[PDB]
Amino acid sequence: AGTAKGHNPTEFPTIYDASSAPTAANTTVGIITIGGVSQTLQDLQQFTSANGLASVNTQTIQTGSSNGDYSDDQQGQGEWDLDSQSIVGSAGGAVQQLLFYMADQSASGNTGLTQAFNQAVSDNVAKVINVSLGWCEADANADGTLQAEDRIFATAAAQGQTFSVSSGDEGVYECNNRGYPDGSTYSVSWPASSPNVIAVGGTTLYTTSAGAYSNETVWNEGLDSNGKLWATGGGYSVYESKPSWQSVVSGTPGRRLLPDISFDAAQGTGALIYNYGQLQQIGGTSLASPIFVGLWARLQSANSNSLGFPAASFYSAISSTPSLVHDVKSGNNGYGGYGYNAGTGWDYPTGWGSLDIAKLSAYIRSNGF
Ligand SMILES: [Ca+2]
Ligand SMILES: [Cl-]
C-alpha cells in the first residue's frame, strides 16, 4: 500500500514518529570514514543551507599516523554524505557536533579502520557512532581483524557508547564475492556481527500521499547488471556466541543473531543526498544505520545522554511491547527461492523492524533503558 519514492532526510522524523522528540542538539555523534571528508563537508553545507537549517558544528580527526593518507576517496564522499545528511535529518536538523573519525588509507591491513574505531572509543566524546561499512566476517576473522576490533567495541559498550553498524547490502551472500548468489550458503558481515554494536538492517519504505508511514517490507532489489544481489544483510554469526538478551528469540542458534533493528534501505525508497553538489537517490543499509543514529541521538538528548548500550533493553522492551516497532512481515533476503523470510516478530532479514520513536521515548520515560 502506500508509494515507493525517494525521501529528503528531513522527512525521516515524520516517517519514524520522532517529530515530538527533542533534536540531537545536546548529543555528539561520530561517523567512521575511510579517508578524508573535504567534499563531504561542502555537501553537508549544501544540505543544511538548502533545508534552511542552522549549520552543523563538525570536526575531522586523523585517527592514525601523522603521515597517513587522509585524502578524499572520491566515491567514498557519497557514502559519508549519505551518512552525515541522513544523521542530521533524522536527528531533527541539529546535532551537538558531528565528528568524522577518518581512517588512514595507507596503513597495513585493516589497521587504519581499527585505529579509527579505537580513536572514537578512547576519546569517548561521541555518544553514538555510525559505521556504514563492513565485509565478510570470515575474512575479518581469518586475519585477526575481528578479534582486534571486537575488543574496542567491548570497551565502547562498557563506556555507554552506541556503535551502529549497517548489516550489509548483499543479502545472505556477503561472503560469496560480496553478494553473488550462492544457493543455500549464507553468511554475514563484520562488524555488524559483533554483540557489542547495534546491527541495522534494511527495509523498503512505503509512505502515504500525505507523507506518513504506510508500511515496510524487506529490502531486496534483486540483481544488478553484474549479477550481484542488493538486499539487507541478516543471519547469524558463525563465530560470535549469542548474548543472553537474544534468548527471547527462541528456536535460533547459540550465535549472535542480526540485525537488531532496521530502517529504510531500498534505493527505490532511499534518501535524496547531495554528492559532489548533485542530488542522488541513495539507499543501502548504509542509509538505515544513519537513520537509527540520528533518531537514537534524539533519545539520548531527551535523557541527558544517560542511556547506555541499548541492545539488552531493545530485546526485553520490544519482545514484551510490540507497539514499539513496525514489525516487517513480508519479503526475503536471498535470491532464487533461497534466503531468510520475514515473519511475525524478530526475523533474520530485519530483526525487530523499525522503531516508533515517540512510543519508545514514552516507554523509556516510564521504564528507563
Ligand atoms: Ca518481523
Ligand atoms: Cl555480550
Curated annotation (Swiss-Prot):
Disulphide-bridged cysteine pairs: C136-C175
Active-site residues (renumbered): E79, D83, S286
Gene name of this polypeptide: pcp
Activity control, per UniProt: Inhibited by 1,2-epoxy-3-(p-nitrophenoxy)propane (EPNP), but not by carboxyl proteinase inhibitors, such as pepstatin, pepstatin Ac (S-PI) and diazoacetyl-DL-norleucine methyl ester (DAN). Inhibited by tyrostatin, pseudo-tyrostatin, AcIPF, AcIAF, chymostatin and pseudo-iodotyrostatin.
Keyword hit for Cell membrane: no
Organism: Pseudomonas sp. (strain 101) (Achromobacter parvulus T1)
Reactions this protein catalyses: Hydrolysis of the B chain of insulin at 13-Glu-|-Ala-14, 15-Leu-|-Tyr-16 and 25-Phe-|-Tyr-26 and angiotensin I at 4-Tyr-|-Ile-5. A good synthetic substrate is Lys-Pro-Ile-Glu-Phe-|-Phe(NO2)-Arg-Leu
Stretches assigned to the Peptidase S53 domain: 3-367
Cofactor binding: number and manner: Binds 1 Ca(2+) ion per subunit.
Mutagenesis / variant outcome for changing D264A: No change in activity with casein as substrate
Protein's name according to its UniProt entry: Sedolisin
EC number: 3.4.21.100
Cofactor(s) needed for function: Ca(2+)
MF GO annotations: metal ion binding; serine-type endopeptidase activity; tripeptidyl-peptidase activity
Part of the full-length chain shown: 217 to 585 of 587
